[PDB]
Amino acid sequence: LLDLIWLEAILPKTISLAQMKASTLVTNQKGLIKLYFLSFLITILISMILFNFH
Amino acid sequence: MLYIVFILSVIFVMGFVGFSSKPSPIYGGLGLIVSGGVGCGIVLNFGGSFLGLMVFLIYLGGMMVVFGYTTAMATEQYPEIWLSNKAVLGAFVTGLLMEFFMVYYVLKDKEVEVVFEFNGLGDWVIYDTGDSGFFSEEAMGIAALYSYGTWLVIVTGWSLLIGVVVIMEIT
Amino acid sequence: NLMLALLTNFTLATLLVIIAFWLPQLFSMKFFLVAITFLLFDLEIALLLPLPWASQTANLNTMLTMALFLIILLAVSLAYEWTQKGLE
Amino acid sequence: XXXXXXXXXXXXXXXXXXXXXXXXXXXXXXXXXXXXXXXXXXXXXXXXXXXXXXXXXXXXXXXXXXXXXXXXXXXXXXXXXXXXXXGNSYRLQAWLYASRLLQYADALEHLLSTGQGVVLERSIYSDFVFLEAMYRQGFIRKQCVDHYNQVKKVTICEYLPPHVVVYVDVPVPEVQSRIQKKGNPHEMKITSAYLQDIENAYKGTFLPEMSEKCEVLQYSAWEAQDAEKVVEDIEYLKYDKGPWLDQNDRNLHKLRMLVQDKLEVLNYTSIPVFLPEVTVGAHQSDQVFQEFTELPGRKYRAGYNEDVGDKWIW
Amino acid sequence: XXXXXXXXXXXXXXXXXXXXXXXXXXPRLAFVGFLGYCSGLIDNAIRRRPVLLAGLHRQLLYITSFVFVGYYLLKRQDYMYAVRDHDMFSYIKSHXXXXXXXXXXXXXXXXXXX
Amino acid sequence: AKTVLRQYWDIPEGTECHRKTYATTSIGGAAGLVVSAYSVALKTPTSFLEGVARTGRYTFTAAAIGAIFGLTSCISAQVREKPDDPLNYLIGGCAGGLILGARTRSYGIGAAACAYMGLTAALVKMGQLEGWQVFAEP
Amino acid sequence: QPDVEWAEQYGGAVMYPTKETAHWKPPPWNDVDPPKDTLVSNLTLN
Amino acid sequence: SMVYMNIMMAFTVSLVGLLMYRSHLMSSLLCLEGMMLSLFVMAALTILNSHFTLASMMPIILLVFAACEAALGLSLLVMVSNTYGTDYVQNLNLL
Amino acid sequence: QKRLGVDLDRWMTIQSAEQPHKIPSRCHAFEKEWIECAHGIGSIRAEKECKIEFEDFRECLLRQKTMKRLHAIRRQREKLIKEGKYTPP
Amino acid sequence: NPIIFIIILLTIMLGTIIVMISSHWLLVWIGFEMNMLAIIPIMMKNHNPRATEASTKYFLTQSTASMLLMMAVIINLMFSGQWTVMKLFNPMASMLMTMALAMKLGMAPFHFWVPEVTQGIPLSSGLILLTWQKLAPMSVLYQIFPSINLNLILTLSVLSILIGGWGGLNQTQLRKIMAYSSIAHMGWMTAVLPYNPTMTLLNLIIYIIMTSTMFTMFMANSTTTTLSLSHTWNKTPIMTVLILATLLSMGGLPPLSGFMPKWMIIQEMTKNNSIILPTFMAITALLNLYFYMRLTYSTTLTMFPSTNNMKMKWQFPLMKKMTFLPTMVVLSTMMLPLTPMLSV
C-alpha cells in the first residue's frame, strides 16, 4: 500500500498529469498556418482587455 | 465644401475594405488603385510636391503593375463575382460598418473613440500651418538631399544590389 | 482647380463608352525576371530623381562622390545581368 | 572552406573526350568485363568491377578486410547456394549496392577534377536488374524490396548525370553453358530461371535509360570482342538531349562537393528503418567495432597511425 | 553601473582608465589555460587521430588563443568591478544622509526552549 | 482588466458577500474566454451551429469554478471566527475542483487532482501578506 | 541493451503517437521531393 | 487630432488584413502595400504641419524601402506557383 | 545604441539640428527646451523635473490643448441660434 | 552557390552591425530588412518542396512583424517627435513595439512558425543562422528597456517556457526539438530585460555558443532521434561524449556552463522583491531538461541501431569552431563567476 504505491505517488502523480499536459501541446494543432494565426487574434485581445495595460 | 481632406479619408478606408475581406487578387488588386489615387490627395493637400507624386510613380505605376504580372503567373482562375461567395460579403459589410458608424458621430463635433485622443472638429485647424517660409519654401519643398545623409545612400544602393542578385539565384 | 481639371477628362471618357454600348438595337516564367528588374532599377531612379532640384544649397564636393555612387552600383546590378540572364 | 575564386574551377580542362562509359547488365557471366578492358583505348582510366570486397579495395590502406571485419556474413559463393531464413539473401545485395555507389562517387570525382575518361564496369543503374531477377523466385521477401526503393529514390537523385555512354549486351538464353565452362567452380550450378529473368529485366531497363536521352549501343555475341568497332561507334555518336549537359558554375560545383567526401556520399545510404535481413543487433556491432579498431590497417585512422606510418607528431 | 556616464562608450579594453595593474600568473588564468589544453585534447576525438595527449602539436595554438583572449577578458573583469565600487563609494560620500551608523547595543532577544 | 481583479481584494475585509459573488463570475468568465478563443484554432466543423457549441462548454464551466469559489469562501467565513486564513480558502479550493468531475462521467480527474487544485487556490491567498510578490521593480 | 523494437518507438513519425493528426507521413532522408508532375510544360498553338 | 483619427482607423483595418487569410496568398502582399500607404500619410502630415525641413526626406527614403519588401517577398510568391499549381495558404507541407 | 559610433559621425536624427537650409523647424522654440532639460543623465531617468517643459513641447506638435479650447468657442457660437451673437468680420 | 554565397552571408553579418551601431529608428528597419533579403536564399539553397513552404512561412510571419515595428516608429513622430532609439515614450506605441519584438524573441504567442521553419531547412549551415539571427532584435530591446510596460513583457516570458516545455515532448524531429529549445531559452531572455539590463546579453553569449556547438555536432547527417541513435556503435563513439556534454549543459545543471546564466536571472529578480515569478521559472525549467534527457539516451543506452551498412572512411566536415567552443560549453562554472561584468 504505502512503501511502494502511496508514498511513491508524489512524483508519478506529477508525471501522469505532466504527460497529459505534454500531449496538449505537441499532438495538438495538426499543422496548418491557418490555426496558429487564429490563436494570435486572441493574444492581442488578452493584452488589451483581460490584462489592464494601456 | 468646408472640408477638403476629410472627405478623401473616407474614400481611403472605403477602398481598404477589400483587403480584410477576400474578393480575389483581381478585385482586391483594384482596391489599391482606388485607395492609392485618392490617397495622393490626402498627402498633396498639406503640401509636398515631390512626395505626393511618388505614390503615382512607384506605388501605383510600379508596385501594383508588377503585381499585375503575378496574378497571371500564379492563381488566375478566371475572375469571378465577389458577391456570390460565402463569408466574403459578411466581412465586407462588417468592415464598412466599423467606420461608417463613426461617420455618424462626426456630427455634433465630438465623436466616441477607442483611443484616448479626441477628434472634435478641426476644419481650419486641420492643416495647422502658417506661411513662414517663402523662397524655397516647405520642409517637403527640399525633401531629399544626398548631403548630411551620406550613410543612407550607401545602404539603399547595397540593398538594391541584393534584390537583383538574390531573385536571379532563386529561379 | 486641379480637381475640376482631372474629373472633366474622365467624365467625358465614360460618356464615349455608353455611345457604343447603349445606342444601337436590332505559363512562361522567364517574363517575370524582366518585370522584377524594372522595379529594382526604378527605385535607384527614385533615389537619383532629386538631383536637379536638390543640388542648389548643399555642398558639391560632398555630393559628387555620393551622386555617382548610386549609378555605379546601378551598372553593377546590370553587370550581374550579363552572367547568363537566359534566352530573353 | 571551399575555394572557387582560385585557378581550379569546374568545366575547365574537361568535357572534351572525358565522358563516362558503362558496360552494364550482361547476364551472370562476365562478358562485358573483358570488352571493357579493351575499351580503354580512348579513355584514360579504367575501373574494376565491384564485388563484396569493393569498398575496402582502397579505402584506407592497400589490403582488404578479412571476412567478418568488412561485413558480417557476406560472400559471393554463399549466394550461389542461397538459403532461406537466417543468412545473406538481401544484406549482401544492400552491401553490393552501397559498394557500387561508393566507387561511382570516386569515379565522378576523378572525372570532375582533371578531365579524364573513366569507364565503369556495372554501374549503380544496373543493381535493380540484379535484385528483381531473384525476386521472381522465392528468396527475397516483399518488405525488403520497399527498403531498397527508399534508398533508390534518395541516393540516385543527388547525382546529376547518369551515364553518357551505355553498353548493353544481350546474349543467348543458353548463357548457363558459358557459365559452366568458366574457371570458377563455386559460380557454377546457378539457377536458369534467375539468369532468364535477369535478361528480361534488362530489356525493361535499357528502354527507360534511352528515355532519359542517354546514348546506348546494342551488341550481340558475334559483334562482341571488338576494339576498333566499339571505339569508332562511341566517337562518331554525339551527345544530345541528355541530362549531362548542365550548368558549369552552379550545378557542377554542387555535385563535386558531394562526390569529394566518401562519408558524405554514403550518409544517405544507411537507412534508419529496421529490417530482419539487415543485421540490427547491437551486441555483434560492439564486438565488430573493437576488432576493427584493433586491426593494423586503420586503427587510429586519417593519415597519422602508430606502427604503420608515423612521420611527425605535429 | 550598466549605462556609461563617465566611461567612454565602445572601448577596446578601457583606455580611459589604465591604472589598475592586471594579474600576473593568476590561478584564474591557469584554469582558462587548462581549458585551452583541454580543447586540444577533445579535437582528436572529433577527427580520429592517434593519442589525445601525444598526438598533433597544433595544441600550442589552442592554449595561446585561450590565454591571449582570457587575459583581455580578465582585464575587463578587474576594470568593471573597480568602476562598480568607485561609483558605490562616491554615492555615500556625496549624499551622506542615505547611510546610517549604529554601534554598541544591549537588546533583549527571545530564547528558544528544548 | 486589472481593475476587476483589484475589486476582489476589497470586499472580504468586511462581512458582506452578496456583491462579492457577482464579481467572481466576471473573473472566471473572462479567463474562460481566453481558452475559448484558442480552441477556435482547432478548426470547427460547419459555421455558427458548432462554433457556439465549442465556446458554450468552455465558458460556462470556467465561470462555474469562480462562482462556487466565491460562495464557499463566505460560508467558511460566516461559520466560526477568523477573518482570513490559508486553511479557510483550502476548503473553498476543493469545492472549485470538485465540479470538474461533473463535466465527464468518470468520478475522478477533478476529484483526483482536488488536492492539487485546492493547494494552488490556497497559494493565491497565501500572498495576502507582504512576504509574497508576483511582479516587482526594485 | 536496446533493440530494434525500442528504436521503432522513437522512430520518425510523431514521437508521441498521434491523437488526431496521424495522417502526416514521415519526411525523406535528405530533403523531400514533392510533385514531379502537375505542370503545364510546353505550350500548344493552332 | 482630427485628420489623424481616420488614418489610424485605416491603419487598423490594414493590420487585420495582414492577420486574416482565406485561401488566397496575394492579399497579404496587397495589405503590406496598404500598411505602408497608411504609414506614408501619417509620416507626411506630422512633418508637413509641424515643420522640420531636414526630416521631410525620411518618408521619401521610407517610400523606397516599402517597395523592397513588396518585391523581394513578392518574388517568393511566383516560386510557390512554380512548385505548386496555384498560390494557396491552405497548401502547406511544414509541421 | 548597443555599439556606439566613434570618430566618424552619421546621425542628423534628433529634432533641432543643423538644417538643410537656413529654415528652422515649426516647433524649434519648444525643441530647445527639451534638449536643454535632458542633457544630464539625472533628468530623463528621473522624469520629474522636466515634466513642465515636455508638456509645452507636447502642446506644439499635437495641438490638443488648443484644439479643446477652440472646440468650446465654436460650440458656443453654434449654441447661440435665435439669440444675441457677435458679428464683425 | 560559388563566391557570392560568402557575400550573401556577409550581408547578414553587416546587417546586424547596422542594428548594433544605430541612433535612428528607420536605420534599424533597414538593418532588419538586410537580414530579410539575405536569409531566404540560404533557406532555399537546393530548392525543395519542403524548402518552398518553409521560406514562405518564414517571410510572411516576419515581414508583417517588422511592419508593426514601423507603426511604432511613426507614433514616435506623432508623439514625442524625436527620431532617437533611447526611449519609447508613449504607452500606445509600446504595445505595438513589444508585440513586434515578441514576433522574433518573445515567442509565447508567436512560436507557431519556428518548428516548421527550422525543420524546413535542407542544410545544417542554415540551422546556425536562425540561432544567430536572434542577436539582432536583442540589441533593440537593450536600448529601449525602460518606459515599456512590464505587465505585457513578462507574460511573453512566463508563457513561452510553458509552451516551450510542452512543445518538444511530442517531437522526434531533431530540428524541431532545437526549435522549441529556442522558445524555452527565450523566456529567460525576456525576463532579465525588466530586471537589470546586464547578463541579458550574456544569456545570448551562453546560448548562441551552446546552439552553434549543437548543430555542428550534427554535421554528420541526422534529422530524427532514430538517425542520431545510430552514432555510438556504427559511427564515431568518442564524438557522442561531446553531444552528451552539450545536451546536459542545455538544461539547468550546476557543474556545466549552462547553469551560470540561470544564476543571475533569479539573483537580480529576487533583489526586486519578486519570489512568486522566479519559482515558476525553475519548475518549468525541468520540462526543458526532459527533451535533452531523452536525447542523451541515444548516447548512453544501447537502443539497438546497428544496421548492415558500416563506415570505415574518416569523416571530414566544415567545423568552424566545433573544437574550441564546446570546451567553453562543457565547463565554464569556475571560469566565469566575475565575467558577468566583462560583457556589459
mmCIF file of N, CA, C and O in Angstrom, chain F residues 46-86:
data_model
loop_
_atom_site.group_PDB
_atom_site.id
_atom_site.type_symbol
_atom_site.label_atom_id
_atom_site.label_comp_id
_atom_site.label_asym_id
_atom_site.label_seq_id
_atom_site.Cartn_x
_atom_site.Cartn_y
_atom_site.Cartn_z
ATOM 1 N N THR F 46 -18.519 23.072 -39.856
ATOM 2 C CA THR F 46 -19.601 23.995 -40.281
ATOM 3 C C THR F 46 -19.391 25.452 -39.812
ATOM 4 O O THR F 46 -18.251 25.875 -39.586
ATOM 5 N N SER F 47 -20.483 26.209 -39.687
ATOM 6 C CA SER F 47 -20.441 27.598 -39.223
ATOM 7 C C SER F 47 -21.579 27.902 -38.251
ATOM 8 O O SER F 47 -22.733 27.541 -38.505
ATOM 9 N N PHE F 48 -21.227 28.556 -37.139
ATOM 10 C CA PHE F 48 -22.152 29.000 -36.070
ATOM 11 C C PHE F 48 -22.849 27.894 -35.265
ATOM 12 O O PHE F 48 -22.922 27.988 -34.037
ATOM 13 N N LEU F 49 -23.355 26.866 -35.949
ATOM 14 C CA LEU F 49 -24.079 25.753 -35.318
ATOM 15 C C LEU F 49 -23.214 24.912 -34.372
ATOM 16 O O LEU F 49 -23.696 24.448 -33.334
ATOM 17 N N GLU F 50 -21.947 24.725 -34.743
ATOM 18 C CA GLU F 50 -20.969 24.010 -33.919
ATOM 19 C C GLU F 50 -19.931 24.965 -33.310
ATOM 20 O O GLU F 50 -19.237 24.608 -32.352
ATOM 21 N N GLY F 51 -19.838 26.171 -33.873
ATOM 22 C CA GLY F 51 -18.945 27.225 -33.383
ATOM 23 C C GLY F 51 -19.307 27.739 -31.999
ATOM 24 O O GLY F 51 -18.425 27.974 -31.171
ATOM 25 N N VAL F 52 -20.609 27.910 -31.761
ATOM 26 C CA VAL F 52 -21.144 28.309 -30.451
ATOM 27 C C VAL F 52 -21.062 27.133 -29.459
ATOM 28 O O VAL F 52 -20.833 27.342 -28.261
ATOM 29 N N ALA F 53 -21.224 25.912 -29.976
ATOM 30 C CA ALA F 53 -21.182 24.674 -29.183
ATOM 31 C C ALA F 53 -19.855 24.445 -28.448
ATOM 32 O O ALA F 53 -19.853 23.980 -27.304
ATOM 33 N N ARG F 54 -18.743 24.771 -29.111
ATOM 34 C CA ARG F 54 -17.405 24.681 -28.511
ATOM 35 C C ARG F 54 -17.137 25.782 -27.483
ATOM 36 O O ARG F 54 -16.488 25.532 -26.465
ATOM 37 N N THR F 55 -17.635 26.989 -27.762
ATOM 38 C CA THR F 55 -17.492 28.136 -26.854
ATOM 39 C C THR F 55 -18.383 27.997 -25.617
ATOM 40 O O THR F 55 -18.037 28.491 -24.541
ATOM 41 N N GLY F 56 -19.520 27.319 -25.788
ATOM 42 C CA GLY F 56 -20.506 27.107 -24.728
ATOM 43 C C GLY F 56 -20.045 26.215 -23.589
ATOM 44 O O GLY F 56 -20.311 26.517 -22.422
ATOM 45 N N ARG F 57 -19.357 25.124 -23.926
ATOM 46 C CA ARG F 57 -18.854 24.168 -22.925
ATOM 47 C C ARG F 57 -17.679 24.697 -22.094
ATOM 48 O O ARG F 57 -17.551 24.356 -20.916
ATOM 49 N N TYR F 58 -16.835 25.523 -22.714
ATOM 50 C CA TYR F 58 -15.632 26.066 -22.073
ATOM 51 C C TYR F 58 -15.906 27.247 -21.137
ATOM 52 O O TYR F 58 -15.368 27.292 -20.029
ATOM 53 N N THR F 59 -16.739 28.185 -21.588
ATOM 54 C CA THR F 59 -17.014 29.426 -20.846
ATOM 55 C C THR F 59 -17.935 29.236 -19.639
ATOM 56 O O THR F 59 -17.734 29.875 -18.603
ATOM 57 N N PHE F 60 -18.935 28.364 -19.782
ATOM 58 C CA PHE F 60 -19.931 28.106 -18.733
ATOM 59 C C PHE F 60 -19.351 27.339 -17.541
ATOM 60 O O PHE F 60 -19.719 27.606 -16.393
ATOM 61 N N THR F 61 -18.453 26.395 -17.825
ATOM 62 C CA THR F 61 -17.785 25.594 -16.788
ATOM 63 C C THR F 61 -16.728 26.393 -16.019
ATOM 64 O O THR F 61 -16.593 26.229 -14.806
ATOM 65 N N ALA F 62 -15.989 27.244 -16.735
ATOM 66 C CA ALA F 62 -14.939 28.087 -16.147
ATOM 67 C C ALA F 62 -15.497 29.192 -15.248
ATOM 68 O O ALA F 62 -14.866 29.565 -14.256
ATOM 69 N N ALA F 63 -16.673 29.708 -15.609
ATOM 70 C CA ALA F 63 -17.396 30.691 -14.798
ATOM 71 C C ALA F 63 -17.993 30.059 -13.539
ATOM 72 O O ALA F 63 -18.140 30.731 -12.514
ATOM 73 N N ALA F 64 -18.333 28.772 -13.635
ATOM 74 C CA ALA F 64 -18.877 27.994 -12.517
ATOM 75 C C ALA F 64 -17.845 27.722 -11.419
ATOM 76 O O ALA F 64 -18.203 27.645 -10.240
ATOM 77 N N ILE F 65 -16.577 27.573 -11.816
ATOM 78 C CA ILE F 65 -15.453 27.370 -10.887
ATOM 79 C C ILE F 65 -15.270 28.600 -9.986
ATOM 80 O O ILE F 65 -15.163 28.464 -8.764
ATOM 81 N N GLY F 66 -15.259 29.784 -10.600
ATOM 82 C CA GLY F 66 -15.123 31.057 -9.889
ATOM 83 C C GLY F 66 -16.300 31.405 -8.994
ATOM 84 O O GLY F 66 -16.106 31.929 -7.893
ATOM 85 N N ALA F 67 -17.511 31.103 -9.467
ATOM 86 C CA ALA F 67 -18.759 31.401 -8.751
ATOM 87 C C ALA F 67 -18.923 30.610 -7.448
ATOM 88 O O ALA F 67 -19.364 31.169 -6.438
ATOM 89 N N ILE F 68 -18.569 29.325 -7.483
ATOM 90 C CA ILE F 68 -18.627 28.445 -6.305
ATOM 91 C C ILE F 68 -17.507 28.795 -5.310
ATOM 92 O O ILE F 68 -17.726 28.777 -4.094
ATOM 93 N N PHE F 69 -16.330 29.133 -5.845
ATOM 94 C CA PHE F 69 -15.172 29.581 -5.054
ATOM 95 C C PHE F 69 -15.468 30.842 -4.234
ATOM 96 O O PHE F 69 -14.994 30.974 -3.103
ATOM 97 N N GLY F 70 -16.246 31.756 -4.817
ATOM 98 C CA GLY F 70 -16.707 32.966 -4.134
ATOM 99 C C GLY F 70 -17.757 32.692 -3.070
ATOM 100 O O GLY F 70 -17.776 33.356 -2.030
ATOM 101 N N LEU F 71 -18.626 31.716 -3.339
ATOM 102 C CA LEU F 71 -19.681 31.301 -2.408
ATOM 103 C C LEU F 71 -19.138 30.539 -1.196
ATOM 104 O O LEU F 71 -19.488 30.860 -0.059
ATOM 105 N N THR F 72 -18.282 29.547 -1.455
ATOM 106 C CA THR F 72 -17.713 28.669 -0.416
ATOM 107 C C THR F 72 -16.780 29.385 0.566
ATOM 108 O O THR F 72 -16.665 28.977 1.726
ATOM 109 N N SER F 73 -16.120 30.443 0.089
ATOM 110 C CA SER F 73 -15.239 31.281 0.909
ATOM 111 C C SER F 73 -16.004 32.076 1.971
ATOM 112 O O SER F 73 -15.481 32.320 3.061
ATOM 113 N N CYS F 74 -17.235 32.468 1.639
ATOM 114 C CA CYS F 74 -18.095 33.250 2.534
ATOM 115 C C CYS F 74 -18.876 32.396 3.536
ATOM 116 O O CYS F 74 -19.193 32.868 4.631
ATOM 117 N N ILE F 75 -19.188 31.156 3.149
ATOM 118 C CA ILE F 75 -19.806 30.168 4.049
ATOM 119 C C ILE F 75 -18.801 29.766 5.139
ATOM 120 O O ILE F 75 -19.156 29.669 6.317
ATOM 121 N N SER F 76 -17.546 29.564 4.730
ATOM 122 C CA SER F 76 -16.442 29.242 5.643
ATOM 123 C C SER F 76 -16.033 30.416 6.548
ATOM 124 O O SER F 76 -15.431 30.205 7.604
ATOM 125 N N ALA F 77 -16.360 31.638 6.123
ATOM 126 C CA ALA F 77 -16.084 32.854 6.896
ATOM 127 C C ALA F 77 -17.162 33.149 7.942
ATOM 128 O O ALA F 77 -16.846 33.584 9.053
ATOM 129 N N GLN F 78 -18.426 32.913 7.578
ATOM 130 C CA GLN F 78 -19.573 33.135 8.470
ATOM 131 C C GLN F 78 -19.664 32.086 9.581
ATOM 132 O O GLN F 78 -19.924 32.428 10.738
ATOM 133 N N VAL F 79 -19.454 30.818 9.220
ATOM 134 C CA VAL F 79 -19.330 29.719 10.187
ATOM 135 C C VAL F 79 -17.956 29.844 10.854
ATOM 136 O O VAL F 79 -16.944 30.003 10.165
ATOM 137 N N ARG F 80 -17.953 29.784 12.190
ATOM 138 C CA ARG F 80 -16.793 30.066 13.072
ATOM 139 C C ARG F 80 -16.184 31.482 12.914
ATOM 140 O O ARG F 80 -16.644 32.277 12.086
ATOM 141 N N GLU F 81 -15.169 31.789 13.724
ATOM 142 C CA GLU F 81 -14.473 33.079 13.677
ATOM 143 C C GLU F 81 -13.388 33.086 12.578
ATOM 144 O O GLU F 81 -13.529 32.382 11.570
ATOM 145 N N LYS F 82 -12.329 33.881 12.778
ATOM 146 C CA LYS F 82 -11.178 34.032 11.857
ATOM 147 C C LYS F 82 -11.528 34.706 10.514
ATOM 148 O O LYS F 82 -12.310 34.157 9.730
ATOM 149 N N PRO F 83 -10.942 35.899 10.249
ATOM 150 C CA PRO F 83 -11.270 36.675 9.046
ATOM 151 C C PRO F 83 -10.692 36.083 7.758
ATOM 152 O O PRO F 83 -11.452 35.792 6.828
ATOM 153 N N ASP F 84 -9.369 35.909 7.709
ATOM 154 C CA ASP F 84 -8.679 35.376 6.532
ATOM 155 C C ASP F 84 -7.565 34.404 6.915
ATOM 156 O O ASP F 84 -6.701 34.726 7.737
ATOM 157 N N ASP F 85 -7.606 33.218 6.308
ATOM 158 C CA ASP F 85 -6.627 32.150 6.539
ATOM 159 C C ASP F 85 -6.388 31.314 5.274
ATOM 160 O O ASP F 85 -7.299 31.184 4.447
ATOM 161 N N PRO F 86 -5.164 30.751 5.112
ATOM 162 C CA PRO F 86 -4.899 29.801 4.018
ATOM 163 C C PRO F 86 -5.675 28.485 4.145
ATOM 164 O O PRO F 86 -5.965 27.844 3.131
#
